[PDB]
Amino acid sequence: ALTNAQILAVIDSWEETVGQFPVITHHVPLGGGLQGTLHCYEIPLAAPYGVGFAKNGPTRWQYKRTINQVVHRWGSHTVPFLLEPDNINGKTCTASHLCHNTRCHNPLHLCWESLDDNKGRNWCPGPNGGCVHAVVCLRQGPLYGPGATVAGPQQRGSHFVV
Amino acid sequence: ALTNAQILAVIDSWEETVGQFPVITHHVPLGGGLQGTLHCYEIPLAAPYGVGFAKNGPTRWQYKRTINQVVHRWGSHTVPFLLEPDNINGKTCTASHLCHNTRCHNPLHLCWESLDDNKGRNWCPGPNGGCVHAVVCLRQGPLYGPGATVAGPQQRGSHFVV
DNA sequence: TTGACTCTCTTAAGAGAGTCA
DNA sequence: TTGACTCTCTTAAGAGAGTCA
Ligand SMILES: [Mg+2]
Ligand SMILES: [Mg+2]
Ligand SMILES: [Zn+2]
Ligand SMILES: [Zn+2]
Ligand SMILES: [Zn+2]
Ligand SMILES: [Zn+2]
């Protein structure tokens, strides 16, 4: 098994490589009608991506290192959290983009939480609009808002009460 | 089926059958520290479910009627919305439980909206806690809250800024 | 050891359709 | 005609693993 020192070395090499990804400045809603800025470190759209990186899906990547002749591979956004518990409350921990930018690998834009917590950030009002996430959102979720509901609750007769 | 009259007849038959489902009172968080009461019309746990109804999955059902000597079948919660557009902004419309109770078929607890709008209600603060859904929530979403994030954003070196 | 591809899987909000009696 | 089962699929937030040179 990999030692703590070996895991730390993996995290350090990952950070070195991601730190050379193009850094893109994005203006984003924070909630409360305020605008802020996030700096995303974006993996390239096509190969080559960077040392150790390869694309396994349209917006999925993996990081691979060979240590003492053994090939180790991780989801590309999971590497910052290799020294953390991998489950909580019986749920698997997932890498969760606070910037809602899949290609971004900035570890200051990632957290490690259940898939439900992860998804829910899509609808958060944001750090200046009422976010209650204990690990605070960096921005208003992209799907926050009144929605586009086509038809509301309704009945033709009188069989129901709310 | 094809005619508006035939579709109205389907909705009316569905409402009459669901109106005979057991009415179960559920006390629910509204947001803002307030509580309300919903009356769900719950499909039975096992067969028989009601005229026209059959279970296709653990919490999936379908309603079927014979019209023009042919069988017409629909998702069991889609029947109230058969006269509505089946898409919005190029996204499929889905039956969406405002009561977050799958077995419930009360059309006063259903709306018709994109799967993204549907999902997002799980995290809504609720009608007394800041819901901004244009078709308003009936309760605070069951997943609303601080979350249980295991690890927040972090870096080991000095390669990144937020 | 490494890059660049390939494949399928998980979850929890939702779906369509076939086999029998 | 109606009932009671069976199967796989969709989506968008996420995953694991194989092949070849
Ligand atoms: Mg996310
Ligand atoms: Mg729902
Ligand atoms: Zn980012
Ligand atoms: Zn938040
Ligand atoms: Zn209900
Ligand atoms: Zn709401």
User: DSSP string covering A75-93, please?
Assistant: ETTTGGGTTS-SEETTEEE
CA B1 centroid distance within chain: 23
Task: Report chain B residues whose CB lies below 8 A from the CB of A8.
Answer: 156
Cβ–Cβ pairs < 8 A, chains A and B: 184
The count of structural domains within chain A is 1
Q: How many CA atoms lie within 13 A of A69 on its CB side?
A: 0
CA B12 centroid distance within chain: 19
Residue with tokens 């419309």: B93
Residue type, A160: F
Could you tell me the two tokens for A103?
């290609």
Could you tell me the two tokens for B17?
């059958």
Please give the sequence-ordered ranges of beta strands (E in DSSP) within chain A, or none if there are none: 23-31, 34-41, 53-57, 60-67, 70-75, 87-88, 91-97, 110-114
Residue ranges making up the domain that contains A80: 1-162
Q: What is the CATH number of the domain that holds A65?
A: 3.90.75.10
Q: How many CA atoms lie within 13 A of A81 on its CB side?
A: 28
Integer angstrom CA distances of residue B11 from A159, B28, B76:
12, 28, 11
Task: Report chain B residues whose CB lies below 8 A from the CB of A15.
Answer: 155-157, 159-160
CA B13, CA B92: separation in Å to the nearest integer?
Answer: 25
What resolution in angstrom units was achieved for this structure? 1.6
Q: In terms of residues, how long is chain B?
A: 162
Could you tell me the two tokens for B131?
């819901």
B93 belongs to the catalytic site: no
Can you name the residues that pair with B23 across neighbouring β-strands? B41
Could you tell me the two tokens for B38?
């919903």
Tell me whether B155 touches chain A (CB under 8 Å).
Answer: yes
Question: Which technique?
Answer: X-ray
Residue type, A14: W
Q: How many CA atoms lie within 13 A of B78 on its CB side?
A: 18
Nearest to A102 by CA among A70, A143, A61, A158: A61
* Residue among A26, A72, A118, A133 flagged as catalytic: A118
Cβ–Cβ < 8 Å for B154, A14: no
Tell me whether A10 touches chain B (CB under 8 Å).
Answer: no
- Chain A segment 87-126 residues within 8 A of B by beta carbon are 88-89, 93, 96, 98, 106-114, 116-117, 119-120, 122-125
CA B104, CA A117: separation in Å to the nearest integer?
Answer: 25
Give alpha helix (H) positions in chain A: 4-18, 115-120
